[PDB]
Structure formats: structure tokens, C-alpha cells
Enzyme design. Structure first.
Site, PDB file in Angstrom:
ATOM      1  N   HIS A 119       0.798  -1.204   0.000  1.00 57.53           N
ATOM      2  CA  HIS A 119       0.000   0.000   0.000  1.00 57.53           C
ATOM      3  C   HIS A 119       0.856   1.292   0.000  1.00 57.53           C
ATOM      4  CE1 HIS A 119       0.807   0.239   4.225  1.00 57.53           C
ATOM      5  NE2 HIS A 119       0.609  -1.045   4.197  1.00 57.53           N
TER       6      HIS A 119
ATOM      7  N   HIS B 216       6.758   6.941   5.499  1.00 65.77           N
ATOM      8  CA  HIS B 216       6.233   6.533   4.205  1.00 65.77           C
ATOM      9  C   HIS B 216       5.506   7.729   3.621  1.00 65.77           C
ATOM     10  CE1 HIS B 216       2.998   5.934   7.160  1.00 65.77           C
ATOM     11  NE2 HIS B 216       2.220   6.372   6.191  1.00 65.77           N
TER      12      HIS B 216
ATOM     13  N   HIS C 238       2.149   9.186   0.828  1.00 67.86           N
ATOM     14  CA  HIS C 238       0.853   8.962   0.200  1.00 67.86           C
ATOM     15  C   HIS C 238       0.922   9.923  -0.974  1.00 67.86           C
ATOM     16  CE1 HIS C 238      -1.047   6.835   3.565  1.00 67.86           C
ATOM     17  NE2 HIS C 238      -0.241   7.588   4.298  1.00 67.86           N
TER      18      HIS C 238
ATOM     19  N   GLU D 236      -3.333  13.413   2.247  1.00 71.26           N
ATOM     20  CA  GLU D 236      -4.456  12.905   3.011  1.00 71.26           C
ATOM     21  C   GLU D 236      -5.109  14.076   3.720  1.00 71.26           C
ATOM     22  OE1 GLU D 236      -2.906   9.289   5.169  1.00 71.26           O
ATOM     23  OE2 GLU D 236      -4.201   8.415   3.627  1.00 71.26           O
TER      24      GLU D 236
ATOM     25  N   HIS E 222       4.677  10.909   6.094  1.00 72.86           N
ATOM     26  CA  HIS E 222       4.308  10.574   7.462  1.00 72.86           C
ATOM     27  C   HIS E 222       5.484   9.925   8.169  1.00 72.86           C
ATOM     28  CE1 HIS E 222      -0.291  10.295   6.479  1.00 72.86           C
ATOM     29  NE2 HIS E 222       0.132  11.544   6.620  1.00 72.86           N
TER      30      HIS E 222
ATOM     31  N   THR F 113      -4.244   6.151   9.298  1.00 70.43           N
ATOM     32  CA  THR F 113      -5.095   6.358   8.124  1.00 70.43           C
ATOM     33  C   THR F 113      -5.239   5.112   7.255  1.00 70.43           C
ATOM     34  OG1 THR F 113      -3.268   7.228   6.792  1.00 70.43           O
ATOM     35  CG2 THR F 113      -4.558   8.812   8.070  1.00 70.43           C
TER      36      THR F 113
END
Ligand SMILES: [Zn+2]
Length: 258
Positions: free
Chosen positions: A62, A92, A94, A104, A117, A196
Site C-alpha cells: 500500500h 512513508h 501517500h 491525506e 508521514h 489512516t
């Protein structure tokens, strides 16, 4: 089936396996700068990353995670709205399929190209596994990425992505300094939230930095070449691995600046 960001297993389906998805302190949220409350009580953040020891970079499916040795207080976060010492365990990102989406958290509904994050856990709980079961177990530092000039300190991460293209692949990643990923100012917003991604536990103190860092179009482009799938399987590009904003409900977002 297994959760993801696809049409049939995306965020809108997560509640079926993880009921907490509809909880009282879910993340991310939209930060309304005009509703945020300036809190003169908040202390400055204390980021001590000089002794950070990175170990490996992994394609977790992911996202990709850059893991650190958290067996001692080498890289810690303190101060701010936190009580105690929080050790860095991994970071990591997003990101989106286009520059206009990917983050996010949003600021006044504005979306950024990506969001970094840095995950830390409260040492009074012994280990990460225990920490996620506590309301003040984790502290996640969120940094927005906007497309513009290249970020020198991020290139080392970008160049190794080819080696962890598919899910499950990992590569040694030592001597990486996370300080190269921080913006100039450390002014922030903070609010109580959750992880999240499943299990979506409500164990996080979010600290979202006001100042975004800029990265180049070429750098973010390489993020988009990763695969959600494992080797030998149908290729699915790793893009739009972000969860949309959740209801703030009965929570207050505080600002360290006025
Ligand atoms: Zn994240």
C-alpha cells in the site's frame, strides 16, 4: 477481499472489516485555518534525528516504508503537545496519480501532491505493538509535498525505488538522514486522530507542519512507477494511496502559530 485503494476494496469499503472506520477520531481531516485555535500553551517541537539509524526500505503493498532501528532512543520526537519521548520507527508517503491530489490532510480544502508521514511511538509502552493500543501511543509528523524544485535529500529514496517495484520486495537502506526531508519552519497544527490505513486505530497525536517541502515533477513521477501488486502478477500502478478527509466531529485543531 483484502483492503486497498481500488474500486472494490477502497476506503469506502473499509468499515466492513474495520468498524472503527466510522469512529469518533478518524484521520485524515480538513484543516480549516480560520477555525483552528492558536494555543500559546503549545511548546516548540523537538526533533532529534542526529543519531537516526535507517535500516531498510520495503514495498509494503500500500506504500513503501523506510524503517529505522527503534531499539534505543536514537531518533526521537518530543515537545509540542507531547508528553514523553516518541521514537521514530518508519516513514512513508501517500501520493496521487496527478499533481492536484495525493495528500491525506487538506488545508482549507486544498490538496497537495503528496504527504510524508514520520511515525513515532511512545516509549513508555515498551514496543510499537503495545503503543497502538493506547490513546497517546503514537505521534505522526505530517509534511506536505508540493511540486516545484527538487528536494536533494529525497533523491536517495527515489533512486532505490526500482529495486522494490513490487509488493514484498525490500532493500538495505542504511545511513539515510531524515533531517533532509524537513521544511525550514516547524510551526504546526495538532489534533487527536487515527492511523489512516487499517486497522485505523485511534492512537495518534497528529502534528501537521504548516510549511510544505517542494519536490520535482521527476521525483514524484518515480513514486508513480511502483506497483501495488507482487511480482508475477497483473501490474497495478501504486497511485492515489490516500484516504479522503473524515468528519472532525467533536475535535479541536490547535495551531502553534498565530
Ligand atoms: Zn500514512
Amino acid at each position: 477481499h483484502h483492503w486497498g485503494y481500488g474500486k472494490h476494496n477502497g476506503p469506502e469499503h473499509w468499515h466492513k472489516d474495520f468498524p472503527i472506520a466510522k469512529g469518533e477520531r478518524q484521520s485524515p481531516v480538513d484543516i480549516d485555518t480560520h477555525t483552528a485555535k492558536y494555543d500559546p500553551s503549545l511548546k516548540p517541537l523537538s526533533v532529534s534525528y542526529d543519531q537516526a539509524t535507517s535500516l531498510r526500505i520495503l514495498n509494503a503493498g500500500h506504500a513503501f516504508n523506510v524503517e529505522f532501528d527503534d531499539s534505543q532512543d536514537k531518533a526521537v520526537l518530543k515537545g509540542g503537545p507531547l508528553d514523553g519521548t516518541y521514537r521514530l520507527i518508519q516513514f512513508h508517503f501517500h501520493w496521487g496519480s496527478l499533481d492536484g491530489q495525493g495528500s491525506e490532510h487538506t488545508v482549507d480544502k486544498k490538496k497537495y501532491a503528496a504527504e510524508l508521514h514520520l511515525v513515532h511511538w511512545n516509549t513508555k509502552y515498551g514496543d510499537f505493538g503495545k503503543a497502538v493500543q493506547q490513546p497517546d501511543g503514537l505521534a505522526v509528523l505530517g509534511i506536505f509535498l508540493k511540486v516545484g524544485s527538487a528536494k536533494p535529500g529525497l533523491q536517495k529514496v527515489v533512486d532505490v525505488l526500482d529495486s522494490i517495484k513490487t509488493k514484498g520486495k525490500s532493500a538495505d537502506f542504511t545511513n539515510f538522514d531524515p533531517r533532509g526531508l524537513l521544511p525550514e519552519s516547524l510551526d504546526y497544527w495538532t489534533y487527536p486522530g487515527s492511523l489512516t490505513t487499517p486497522p485505523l486505530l485511534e492512537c495518534v497525536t497528529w502534528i501537521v507542519l504548516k510549511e510544505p517541502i517542494s519536490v520535482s515533477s521527476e521525483q514524484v513521477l518515480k513514486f508513480r512507477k511502483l506497483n501495488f501488486n507482487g511480482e508475477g502478477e497483473p501490474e497495478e500502478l501504486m497511485v492515489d494511496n490516500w484516504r479522503p478527509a473524515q468528519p472532525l466531529k467533536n475535535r479541536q485543531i490547535k495551531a502553534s502559530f498565530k
